[PDB]
Amino acid sequence: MRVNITLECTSCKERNYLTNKNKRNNPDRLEKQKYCPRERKVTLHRET
Amino acid sequence: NRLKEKYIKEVTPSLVEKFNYSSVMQTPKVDKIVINMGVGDAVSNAKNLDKAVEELALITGQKPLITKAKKSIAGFRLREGMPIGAKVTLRGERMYEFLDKLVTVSLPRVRDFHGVSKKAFDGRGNYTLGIKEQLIFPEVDYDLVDKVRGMDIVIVTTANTDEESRELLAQLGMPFQ
Amino acid sequence: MITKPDKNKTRQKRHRRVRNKISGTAECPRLNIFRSNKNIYAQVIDDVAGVTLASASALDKEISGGTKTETAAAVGKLVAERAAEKGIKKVVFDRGGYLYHGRVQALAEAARENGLEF
Amino acid sequence: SNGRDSESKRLGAKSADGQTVTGGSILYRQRGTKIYPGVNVGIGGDDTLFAKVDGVVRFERKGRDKKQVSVYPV
Amino acid sequence: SIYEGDYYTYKKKYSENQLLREKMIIQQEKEVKELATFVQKAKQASQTNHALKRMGLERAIRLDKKKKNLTKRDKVYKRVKMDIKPNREVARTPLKVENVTFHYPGHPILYKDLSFQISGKERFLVVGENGVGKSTLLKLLMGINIPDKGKIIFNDKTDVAYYSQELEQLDEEKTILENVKSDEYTDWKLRATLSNFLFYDDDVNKKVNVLSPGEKARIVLCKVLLQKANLLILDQPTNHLDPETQSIIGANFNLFEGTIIVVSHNPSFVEQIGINRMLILPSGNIDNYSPELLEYYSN
Amino acid sequence: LVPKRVKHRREFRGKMRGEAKGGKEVAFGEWGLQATESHWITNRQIEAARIAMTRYMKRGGKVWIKIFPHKSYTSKAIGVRMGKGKGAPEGWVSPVKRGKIMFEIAGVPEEVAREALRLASHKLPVKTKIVKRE
Amino acid sequence: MKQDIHPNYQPVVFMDSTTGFKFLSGSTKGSSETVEWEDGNTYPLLRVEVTSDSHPFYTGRQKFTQADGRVDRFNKKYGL
RNA sequence: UUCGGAUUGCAGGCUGCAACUCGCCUGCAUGAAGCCGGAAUCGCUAGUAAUCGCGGAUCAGCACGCCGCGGUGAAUACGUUC
RNA sequence: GCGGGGUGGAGCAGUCAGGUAGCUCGUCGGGCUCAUAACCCGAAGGUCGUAGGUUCAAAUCCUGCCCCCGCAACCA
RNA sequence: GUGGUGGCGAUAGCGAGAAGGAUACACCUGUUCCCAUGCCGAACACAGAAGUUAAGCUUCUUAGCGCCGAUUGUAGUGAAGGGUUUCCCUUUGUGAGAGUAGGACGUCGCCACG
RNA sequence: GCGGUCGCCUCCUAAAAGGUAACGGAGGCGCCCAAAGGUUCCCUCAGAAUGGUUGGAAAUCAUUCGAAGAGUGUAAAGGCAGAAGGGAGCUUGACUGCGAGACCUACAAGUCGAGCAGGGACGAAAGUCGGGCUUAGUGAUCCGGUGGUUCCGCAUGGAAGG
RNA sequence: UGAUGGAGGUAGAGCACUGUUUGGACUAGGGGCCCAUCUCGGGUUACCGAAUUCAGAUAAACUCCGAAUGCCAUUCAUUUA
Ligand SMILES: [K+]
Ligand SMILES: [K+]
Ligand SMILES: [K+]
Ligand SMILES: [K+]
Ligand SMILES: [K+]
Ligand SMILES: [K+]
Ligand SMILES: [K+]
Ligand SMILES: [K+]
Ligand SMILES: [K+]
Ligand SMILES: [K+]
Ligand SMILES: [Mg+2]
Ligand SMILES: [Mg+2]
Ligand SMILES: [Mg+2]
Ligand SMILES: [Mg+2]
Ligand SMILES: [Mg+2]
Ligand SMILES: [Mg+2]
Ligand SMILES: [Mg+2]
Ligand SMILES: [Mg+2]
Ligand SMILES: [Mg+2]
Ligand SMILES: [Mg+2]
Ligand SMILES: [Mg+2]
Ligand SMILES: [Mg+2]
Ligand SMILES: [Zn+2]
């Protein structure tokens, strides 16, 4: 089951990115180091 | 190293003379020994492959590489990439030691051993011995074996012709039939 | 019967792919490295003109020698200074299809230290 | 049951050989690299050949059996 | 869902609701089949029968609207299936315990010169109360505890399977499949049995650390089942199990064709197994099983 | 004659214009039947001509059928209006263009060959003539 | 050669028990008994009852009697 | 299994003109099924059953069968419903 | 062209909702009977129509194909 | 001459045969070193210079294959017309593929050691 | 009328730019992938012959031949063996604000895009990276949900609601 | 309209790929016949024959090739608007 997901910056809680993932292949919340435009630096974003 | 010593001392001059080699570089030599262990039973239970790998490692002294099925085959209940079959590659000193042990100890212990075949050649000068059963190698321990299995040992040499390979292998010691 | 592939041929197969994205200009020449079992050779080339601006190697007789790695360092220093004399500072380093690990890496570091910017 | 077909994608050459084009002009629309990007020419994500800089478009033959596009500024 | 009353009232109310729901789905299916049956009759009629063809399309529209409002029957939760069989056969003397004394260093002796002998295909109950040595005795047989005195002999024909009381046989760090991995079982064989224990598909890749106590209990039981031993040392097996799984466990053990050394404070579970001999603690008493178990409990 | 397999169930009728691309000379047999006009030839016509030729030859000698009916053609039943897709395949044909050597024969005297080829021609729908090997 | 993945390997001497013919070769098995060897070096020793020299095939002379034919058996039994 | 003694190889003994079709017996060699037996079924109320040997008639040779003999030696019979 | 079906000798389950091939009758053999029937006890008989895919795993899901059945193949 | 390194459509290739290592390149010896093989110092990496042109590589011969390929003719066809018009023909311009004559066992540069 | 069809992608029709109809001839899509993305390094296939325990046409192994006859998640076409195919290491560029100029086009849309800035991944460096060999995998507005917001706030401060 | 340069795979042609396909040669191999059956080894049909090879065809959805035209463009040329 592949679903659209939102990656939110952990630092400022800003829903910066939209992506998608297969729940079965990745049961746990995804986490990626992405650039947060609000904070203007690379931060850890975790699916919401 | 004994087999290597025997090669360089006796075999190399003998082959040079027999085949009138202009330069010593022409001398055929054993390049590598590839021992292959085909285990289709891994499909039924991977523990058969595990024990085969363990026995092979004990025999060879090197951890074997576990080959995988390049193509799925339904006839054998085989799936592509399944870890069926293992092999070990021996070169240099380990190659010579294993061949020497095979000639001296392993081969005689074969039941009613009348020698090895003399037609099992690729046609280029490389030989392959199909061992029917283990327990001929002293490291197998004759009891741990829950399932008896064989193997296929491939002697690859720089001989262009099967005749040179046979003579070289004979001089190194090979009980042909 | 078994054929051992020519190591130089395999090197060149890799080297073509490297050259697909590394090329030498008059103002940014190509630093090409050739590694032999005995020696190592470096050239500074302008592919556009197809002329070697500078050259050095273990046979210059100005390299006192030693371990092949140390000879590579001497070659790097010598080629860098010769290129500087001819007015070259920047270059693009072609590893000749080799692995940027040993003698070639030593030569590259020597060139960097002795003045070639890359 | 037949009767389906996609919209034509208007592929082909969009600039003539010897024509002067502004930088970034699309020169050739293609599926795959039917023609390769040459001097001052880039290839887009969908294989489209465009001019990097202003110049004259030239379709040469890349070797024995391949074509190529270059843009030569004047 | 929250009901007012007791467990039976919940069962009564629940059973009725699923019954009344089931009847609703039956009638919705009949109407759909009826329309479907008419739609097919029109579909295969001659193209020259215009009116029937017309009515067929009109009913095709109703059929579509029906199939889109047709309640799905909830899949009834599947119950555990256990088939425990011994690889080998029991002997007349599976286990010999003779003059066994044991004490935990610094504590009173639990039993002195304990001697019993099991018969084979016997239901042996180790009765007692809390903190009396029941689990210690079972640990003694397996080898966890070395007897202070005496001997414990297992016949060479006896294979033993141990179910510990506190679920100490699972690696919390590993997954369900990794825990059950055995040299004697292939992958699909493991999955099939785990499916018999209600672990479906990627439920077997879950870490044991996140499972509930009840789900962990099934994994331990599965390990016991996969041994195919002829002697079962079970220490409170029904603990942590839902009432439905308990009855399944007891019924299957009753049919087990092997020796069972069991401990259980659950009166229902022991009744299903049909105990033969009970060993009372701390007062060592090898006795024939009967409702006299209550007499020992009273005393 | 019918192909064992076909890439496509249905195919364009096509167009016949000019001389045949190849096979305009007798290759195997001593004599051959050359088409002087272009026309479709059905497997039925090929078979009829072949049977006539063999029967007159008394099975003495060899016969080659140079042409083969690769192409398929469809049709629509009576009472079917235009439209609603192409018709179901009906028969097989070989588009034969003038100059094609449809049949060859060998191992027989000239007069027997000429008479056998004459019978075959009358079975075929195209005007033909006899051509001798070179 | 990678470390900590291969089974243990050590040089070991071999003697033919039937003859005593001696040779040095590596092995995975370990022999409690150890013997010395020219160059004054000691290694574990694996006594071998059947080796190349021992086995009849390598020597060229076969121990077995090849049995007796029935004709000769009959002649012997009945003195004919 | 030191139970088992089938099957099989070799080598012997005998009787007889003759042991292959096709005898018994012995030595070495091997060690089969078989772990107390489904539906049902047989004998027996005492020196009986059960169990153990011995003789003999036929008979050149050939019995686990038959006739007979002796050794040890029970359990049970409530009762006539089936 | 529209549907329905291919599982032991026959008739059916099991499918939906993937983990395990059963049920009834019948057949073979043995019992019981004077004999037959009925009855009692054993045993056999299918890799799920076939060929490919999904899956750790297919009678089960997907694709095609071959068979069997019913219907239709033209209306003023 | 040899080694690097390039440009030009293989006319630069392939096959076959022959000669050479002065240097150079090579095989070649080893695994202590950085470094490595889903096993193997075979590879890659590193150290070294005993032996050999055997192979690779360079040079040379070879038209067997591959490659290039004129001219002529023809098919097709633009244009203008004609005919008995599912097709065919004329004038005019263009003109292949195929088959061939032949060409070709490369050439034009730069660097270093000779 | 019945049957079929309705949007999108690929091929032929399509007449060597592009475009081009038919209830013309063939197939696909309503996804998938946390790597099957990025980068650095490395590697080359399918089959055939010969030899070889289980093992058989065919499992695994070796030598040789083999230029693509394989593979490229998914239809077809185009393209790719200087890989776009295959393996490993590290990573998240499957980035943010844009965007000269182009293609396509009635509009709405659709497509490509150097380059600039911010801050990064890989690599020694050059440099590559704004998803995947390319081309389908999608739906206007209205209305509503959720998060953020230095915006507004019906006398003013809030709020309500935007 | 001429000149020049280009993009593209149609007509034609071709078989280098993929389909369809004919005859010859040879045969892996499959067939039934008998001997030998432990169905084992022959000996057979000008028995049937894969693949290979030779020769010969064929194609909208084949291409080693490939026009005439048309098309795009040129600070070009002539005429024109
Ligand atoms: K005619
Ligand atoms: K007898
Ligand atoms: K009995
Ligand atoms: K007698
Ligand atoms: K080396
Ligand atoms: K050489
Ligand atoms: K040539
Ligand atoms: K990667
Ligand atoms: K062809
Ligand atoms: K065409
Ligand atoms: Mg299209
Ligand atoms: Mg893209
Ligand atoms: Mg306890
Ligand atoms: Mg017993
Ligand atoms: Mg009486
Ligand atoms: Mg008596
Ligand atoms: Mg030509
Ligand atoms: Mg056109
Ligand atoms: Mg077009
Ligand atoms: Mg890819
Ligand atoms: Mg206000
Ligand atoms: Mg044509
Ligand atoms: Zn943030």
PDB file of N, CA and C in Angstrom, chain E residues 182-214:
ATOM      1  N   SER E 182      14.701 -22.694  12.865  1.00  0.00           N
ATOM      2  CA  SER E 182      15.238 -23.980  13.274  1.00  0.00           C
ATOM      3  C   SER E 182      15.949 -24.612  12.089  1.00  0.00           C
ATOM      4  N   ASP E 183      16.949 -25.441  12.392  1.00  0.00           N
ATOM      5  CA  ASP E 183      17.685 -26.130  11.340  1.00  0.00           C
ATOM      6  C   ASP E 183      16.836 -27.170  10.625  1.00  0.00           C
ATOM      7  N   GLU E 184      15.760 -27.627  11.252  1.00  0.00           N
ATOM      8  CA  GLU E 184      14.954 -28.727  10.747  1.00  0.00           C
ATOM      9  C   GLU E 184      13.745 -28.263   9.948  1.00  0.00           C
ATOM     10  N   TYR E 185      13.542 -26.957   9.805  1.00  0.00           N
ATOM     11  CA  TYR E 185      12.344 -26.430   9.170  1.00  0.00           C
ATOM     12  C   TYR E 185      12.731 -25.393   8.130  1.00  0.00           C
ATOM     13  N   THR E 186      12.110 -25.481   6.959  1.00  0.00           N
ATOM     14  CA  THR E 186      12.344 -24.508   5.906  1.00  0.00           C
ATOM     15  C   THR E 186      11.436 -23.299   6.089  1.00  0.00           C
ATOM     16  N   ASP E 187      11.648 -22.291   5.244  1.00  0.00           N
ATOM     17  CA  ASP E 187      10.982 -21.011   5.453  1.00  0.00           C
ATOM     18  C   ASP E 187       9.469 -21.144   5.354  1.00  0.00           C
ATOM     19  N   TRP E 188       8.971 -21.714   4.255  1.00  0.00           N
ATOM     20  CA  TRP E 188       7.525 -21.770   4.081  1.00  0.00           C
ATOM     21  C   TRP E 188       6.882 -22.644   5.144  1.00  0.00           C
ATOM     22  N   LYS E 189       7.600 -23.658   5.627  1.00  0.00           N
ATOM     23  CA  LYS E 189       7.067 -24.465   6.716  1.00  0.00           C
ATOM     24  C   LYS E 189       6.892 -23.619   7.965  1.00  0.00           C
ATOM     25  N   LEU E 190       7.857 -22.743   8.244  1.00  0.00           N
ATOM     26  CA  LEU E 190       7.734 -21.866   9.400  1.00  0.00           C
ATOM     27  C   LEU E 190       6.567 -20.907   9.227  1.00  0.00           C
ATOM     28  N   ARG E 191       6.398 -20.364   8.020  1.00  0.00           N
ATOM     29  CA  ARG E 191       5.342 -19.383   7.817  1.00  0.00           C
ATOM     30  C   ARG E 191       3.980 -20.042   7.958  1.00  0.00           C
ATOM     31  N   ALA E 192       3.839 -21.255   7.423  1.00  0.00           N
ATOM     32  CA  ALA E 192       2.552 -21.931   7.477  1.00  0.00           C
ATOM     33  C   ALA E 192       2.131 -22.156   8.919  1.00  0.00           C
ATOM     34  N   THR E 193       3.072 -22.579   9.761  1.00  0.00           N
ATOM     35  CA  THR E 193       2.753 -22.820  11.160  1.00  0.00           C
ATOM     36  C   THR E 193       2.491 -21.514  11.888  1.00  0.00           C
ATOM     37  N   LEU E 194       3.257 -20.473  11.570  1.00  0.00           N
ATOM     38  CA  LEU E 194       3.002 -19.184  12.190  1.00  0.00           C
ATOM     39  C   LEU E 194       1.642 -18.654  11.773  1.00  0.00           C
ATOM     40  N   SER E 195       1.195 -19.010  10.570  1.00  0.00           N
ATOM     41  CA  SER E 195      -0.153 -18.653  10.156  1.00  0.00           C
ATOM     42  C   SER E 195      -1.183 -19.434  10.953  1.00  0.00           C
ATOM     43  N   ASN E 196      -0.880 -20.691  11.275  1.00  0.00           N
ATOM     44  CA  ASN E 196      -1.749 -21.450  12.162  1.00  0.00           C
ATOM     45  C   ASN E 196      -1.815 -20.825  13.543  1.00  0.00           C
ATOM     46  N   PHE E 197      -0.810 -20.038  13.918  1.00  0.00           N
ATOM     47  CA  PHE E 197      -0.815 -19.304  15.173  1.00  0.00           C
ATOM     48  C   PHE E 197      -1.203 -17.844  14.989  1.00  0.00           C
ATOM     49  N   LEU E 198      -1.806 -17.501  13.850  1.00  0.00           N
ATOM     50  CA  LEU E 198      -2.376 -16.178  13.627  1.00  0.00           C
ATOM     51  C   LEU E 198      -1.308 -15.110  13.427  1.00  0.00           C
ATOM     52  N   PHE E 199      -0.174 -15.474  12.854  1.00  0.00           N
ATOM     53  CA  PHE E 199       0.833 -14.513  12.413  1.00  0.00           C
ATOM     54  C   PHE E 199       0.879 -14.535  10.889  1.00  0.00           C
ATOM     55  N   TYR E 200       0.240 -13.545  10.271  1.00  0.00           N
ATOM     56  CA  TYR E 200      -0.012 -13.540   8.836  1.00  0.00           C
ATOM     57  C   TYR E 200       0.940 -12.571   8.145  1.00  0.00           C
ATOM     58  N   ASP E 201       1.672 -13.071   7.155  1.00  0.00           N
ATOM     59  CA  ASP E 201       2.456 -12.231   6.241  1.00  0.00           C
ATOM     60  C   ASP E 201       3.482 -11.469   7.074  1.00  0.00           C
ATOM     61  N   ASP E 202       3.599 -10.152   6.925  1.00  0.00           N
ATOM     62  CA  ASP E 202       4.645  -9.402   7.602  1.00  0.00           C
ATOM     63  C   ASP E 202       4.427  -9.297   9.097  1.00  0.00           C
ATOM     64  N   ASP E 203       3.396  -9.938   9.647  1.00  0.00           N
ATOM     65  CA  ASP E 203       3.301 -10.001  11.094  1.00  0.00           C
ATOM     66  C   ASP E 203       4.418 -10.828  11.701  1.00  0.00           C
ATOM     67  N   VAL E 204       5.123 -11.622  10.896  1.00  0.00           N
ATOM     68  CA  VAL E 204       6.219 -12.420  11.421  1.00  0.00           C
ATOM     69  C   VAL E 204       7.525 -11.642  11.461  1.00  0.00           C
ATOM     70  N   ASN E 205       7.620 -10.530  10.741  1.00  0.00           N
ATOM     71  CA  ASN E 205       8.797  -9.680  10.791  1.00  0.00           C
ATOM     72  C   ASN E 205       8.756  -8.680  11.933  1.00  0.00           C
ATOM     73  N   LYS E 206       7.682  -8.660  12.712  1.00  0.00           N
ATOM     74  CA  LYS E 206       7.616  -7.753  13.844  1.00  0.00           C
ATOM     75  C   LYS E 206       8.595  -8.192  14.920  1.00  0.00           C
ATOM     76  N   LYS E 207       9.214  -7.219  15.580  1.00  0.00           N
ATOM     77  CA  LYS E 207      10.108  -7.532  16.683  1.00  0.00           C
ATOM     78  C   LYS E 207       9.315  -8.124  17.835  1.00  0.00           C
ATOM     79  N   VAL E 208       9.913  -9.101  18.517  1.00  0.00           N
ATOM     80  CA  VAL E 208       9.231  -9.700  19.651  1.00  0.00           C
ATOM     81  C   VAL E 208       9.040  -8.693  20.769  1.00  0.00           C
ATOM     82  N   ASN E 209       9.841  -7.628  20.795  1.00  0.00           N
ATOM     83  CA  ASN E 209       9.735  -6.650  21.866  1.00  0.00           C
ATOM     84  C   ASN E 209       8.429  -5.866  21.809  1.00  0.00           C
ATOM     85  N   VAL E 210       7.759  -5.809  20.652  1.00  0.00           N
ATOM     86  CA  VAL E 210       6.527  -5.028  20.520  1.00  0.00           C
ATOM     87  C   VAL E 210       5.270  -5.877  20.638  1.00  0.00           C
ATOM     88  N   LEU E 211       5.394  -7.196  20.708  1.00  0.00           N
ATOM     89  CA  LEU E 211       4.224  -8.051  20.798  1.00  0.00           C
ATOM     90  C   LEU E 211       3.636  -8.015  22.201  1.00  0.00           C
ATOM     91  N   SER E 212       2.365  -8.377  22.292  1.00  0.00           N
ATOM     92  CA  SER E 212       1.718  -8.498  23.584  1.00  0.00           C
ATOM     93  C   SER E 212       2.123  -9.808  24.245  1.00  0.00           C
ATOM     94  N   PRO E 213       1.919  -9.927  25.555  1.00  0.00           N
ATOM     95  CA  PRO E 213       2.224 -11.205  26.215  1.00  0.00           C
ATOM     96  C   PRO E 213       1.501 -12.383  25.596  1.00  0.00           C
ATOM     97  N   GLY E 214       0.248 -12.197  25.186  1.00  0.00           N
ATOM     98  CA  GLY E 214      -0.487 -13.299  24.593  1.00  0.00           C
ATOM     99  C   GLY E 214       0.110 -13.747  23.275  1.00  0.00           C
TER     100      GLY E 214
END
